[PDB]
């Protein structure tokens, strides 16, 4: 061949923390189909927003929006348990089909994105230029979102374990753990990676008895 149809930019969705998760990498030959299984951010979440993104930036907000759509009808469950399979399918004609299927409730929602949607030849080079220009800033943002999701996981898992524990946990441990969770919740609102890790460290220093009980 003298020619290849390829994707000039990454295609993916927004995940928790406002990060782009890539489903189809830059410079992929079409046609192509990739899928990844995602889950819910919160307990008893009834729906997901699929925000489709084109670009090379880690921040969802810094990429081109191709559209969004909801999948409703998710049955009550702990966060992280529902299986929401997302499929990006680019046909020979260069049309992007995005689907989200609930593997429990079997429900499906799709968006179809014409071959002409997204960033023009110029904007593509400006986007590729920015990726490499703001690469350090995108790393820093990425490990703040990682830190934030670890702290949020520790917050939620610890509250769960305080409850399962009931009377098994000394009053002294519970006061100390309760104060640390409040302090961690507050810091998770902020932007300060160091302050999140400090509250995560406080909770881990005071939680040793609770961790034994969770056994």
């Amino acid at each position: 061949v003298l020619l290849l149809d390829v994707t000039p930019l990454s295609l993916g969705i927004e995940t928790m923390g406002g990060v782009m998760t890539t489903l189809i990498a830059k410079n992929t030959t079409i046609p192509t189909k990739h899928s990844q299984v995602f889950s819910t951010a919160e307990d008893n979440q009834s729906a997901v927003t699929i925000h489709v993104l084109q670009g090379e930036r880690k921040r969802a907000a810094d990429n081109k929006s191709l559209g969004q759509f909801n999948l409703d009808g998710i049955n009550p469950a702990p966060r992280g348990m529902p299986q929401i399979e997302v499929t990006f399918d680019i046909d020979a004609d260069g049309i992007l089909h995005v689907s989200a299927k609930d593997k429990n409730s079997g429900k499906e929602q799709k968006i179809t994105i014409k071959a002409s949607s997204g960033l023009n030849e110029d904007e593509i080079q400006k986007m590729v230029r920015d990726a490499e220009a703001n690469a350090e800033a995108d790393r820093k943002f990425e490990e703040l979102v990682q830190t934030r999701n670890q702290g949020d996981h520790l917050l939620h898992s610890t509250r769960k374990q305080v409850e399962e524990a009931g009377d098994k946990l000394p009053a002294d441990d519970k006061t100390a753990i309760e104060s640390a969770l409040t302090a961690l919740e507050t810091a998770l609102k902020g932007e300060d990676k160091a302050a999140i890790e400090a509250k995560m460290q406080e909770l881990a220093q005071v939680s040793q008895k609770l961790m034994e009980i969770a056994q």
Binding site: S39, V48, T49, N149
Partner: peptide
Amino acid sequence: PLLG
């Protein structure tokens, strides 16, 4: 791997 989570969506809001």
